[PDB]
Amino acid sequence: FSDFLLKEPTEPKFKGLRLELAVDKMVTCIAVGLPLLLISLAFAQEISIGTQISCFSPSSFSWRQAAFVDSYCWAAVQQKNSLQSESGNLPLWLHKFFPYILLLFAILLYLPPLFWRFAAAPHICSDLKFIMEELDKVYNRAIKAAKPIVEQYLKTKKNSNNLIIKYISCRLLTLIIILLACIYLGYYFSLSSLSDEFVCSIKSGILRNDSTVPDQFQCKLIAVGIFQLLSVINLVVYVLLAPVVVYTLFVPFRQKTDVLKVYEILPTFDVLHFKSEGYNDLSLYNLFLEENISEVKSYKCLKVLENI
Amino acid sequence: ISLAFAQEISIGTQISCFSPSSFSWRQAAFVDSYCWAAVQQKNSLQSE
Amino acid sequence: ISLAFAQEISIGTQISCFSPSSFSWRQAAFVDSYCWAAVQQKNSLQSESGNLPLWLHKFFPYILLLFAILLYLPPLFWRFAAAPHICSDLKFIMEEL
Amino acid sequence: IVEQYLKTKKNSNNLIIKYISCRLLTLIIILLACIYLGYYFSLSSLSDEFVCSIKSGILRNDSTVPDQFQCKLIAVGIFQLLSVINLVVYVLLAPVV
């Protein structure tokens, strides 16, 4: 009990706070930023050196007939009419549309943070600002006496489940999308065959019953050997990222019930009630506050007291 | 639309016709341009 | 990497093979594309003692960019994990002095 | 009050281990990049030339394709120079770390 500095009231408070946790923004950062990076690198090298397909046409063909054979056999991996590799026809379908599927997973790994921004941002923002102003004002009356409203609010949030289920649902959606991307990339690398080569035929329309076109063409898909490398490194990153996402589901486990242990030195609080050990909104606030304690200077001023 | 335009301007044209080998390059380009511009009018397309 | 990509897209391709004179233009382009795409699989390359150098020569800029990315994550972790604590403690000790 | 705060920080280890772990991660990534670039320059052979073959699918049992092709990788001689200067810079940077 001595003299300590009082806190002036200021209106521009906290310069905007952390509406997301630390490791969750990092996880969505890496999990959306990796496949877009791989897609951009693949498109740069593909538009630099090479086409997507190349077929071996006879020497008596002109240039435009060889270009027709390339365009026809590129456009005819969809329909299963005559490709002579129907056991691996679905790999031939996947080899054309791999970057579209990778970009689709990159888009679907972005919607749960957008829903968290449009649905859970201003409620947690206003509640954090209110509890911070309440702590800042309840510290100022402590030194004037030396010259419980939060204890009921933390009971109010004890019996409510309206934000923790939203947080858990967003994390579970992110986890199952991660697992589906993992099994898809594992399958696409696990084909791994000589499935880039196939046999195409152009005798379909009035070119049937001809004697100039040679009835068989050997075609090869060029960009498969880069796609398999991209799938390997993306699979390795997502497998190393999955234990973090299963670790951030145990909300009452990775919390410490001493974020307001320092405030019982002030004789008015007697704040000891944090025996939650459960899945209430109090256990979510107990972790959303512990990262955000760097904007109450009363906490820093009280940190010097109990250790001497 | 942006993804389709990127892949279309990357790899491929819109149409390709199979002209005989005795044609030159510009005659094959004429056949491509003509049969691309003639899907509007229904004169002789055999798939009416 | 940027200088190498500028000079590579300026003057040259990545591979060039010597096809016979009776081939047309598109058959020579097929031979180039095929032998560029077939340095991965070890079927018939006749230099299997140095096959891993042939694999590395294609993917050198990817590996160099991967090391450039992995040399960036520890400052990002220091920014997301050790910045505001040291910031507030420095401001407090400065105001105290 | 500062004479007790500097005793408070005297018995805590929560930021120095984070700083040391970030520097050690940076050092081992630097050393792995150094040994990789050293190996890639140390191959240095005539490994840019190789012999390719296209007789794989229905082109097997043919009489027009000439069964052997001499191919050469073009951009190797620039990559070796880039690896040399990157290795020299990282070796001079390791004593600072």
Numbering used by the authors:
A (entry chain A): 12 to 158, 194 to 354
B (entry chain D): 50 to 97
C (entry chain F): 50 to 146
D (entry chain F): 195 to 291
Question: Would you copy out the relevant sentences from the publication that reported this structure?
Answer:
Pannexin 1 (PANX1) plays extensive physiological roles across diverse fields of biology, including cell death, inflammation, cancer progression, and neurological disorders. As suggested by biochemical analysis, PANX1 forms an oligomeric channel for the facilitated diffusion of ions and large molecules across the plasma membrane upon activation. The overall structure of human PANX1 presents a novel heptameric assembly, which is distinct from gap junction channels (connexins and innexins)8,9 and functionally related channels, such as CALHM and LRRC8. Interestingly, the protomer of PANX1 shares a similar fold of four transmembrane helices with the aforementioned channels.
Among the classes of 2D particle images, the images representing the top views or bottom views exhibited seven obvious subunits in each detergent micelle. This observation differs from the previously proposed hexameric assembly of PANX1.7 Finally, the map was refined to 3.1 Å resolution. The model we built contained an almost intact extracellular region, transmembrane domain, and partial intracellular region. Three fractions (N-terminal, 1–12; 158–193, between TM2 and TM3; and C-terminal, 355–426) were missing in the final model. Thus, the structure of full-length PANX1 was employed for the following structural analysis due to its clearer density map. As the result shows, the radius of the narrowest constrictive site is ~4.7 Å, which is contributed by W74. I58 from the tail of TM1 forms a larger hydrophobic ring. We discovered a shrink ring formed by residues (T21/E22/P23) in the N-terminus. However, disordered CT tails are missing in the structure of full-length PANX1. Given that the pore is more than 9 Å wide, an open conformation of PANX1 was probably captured.
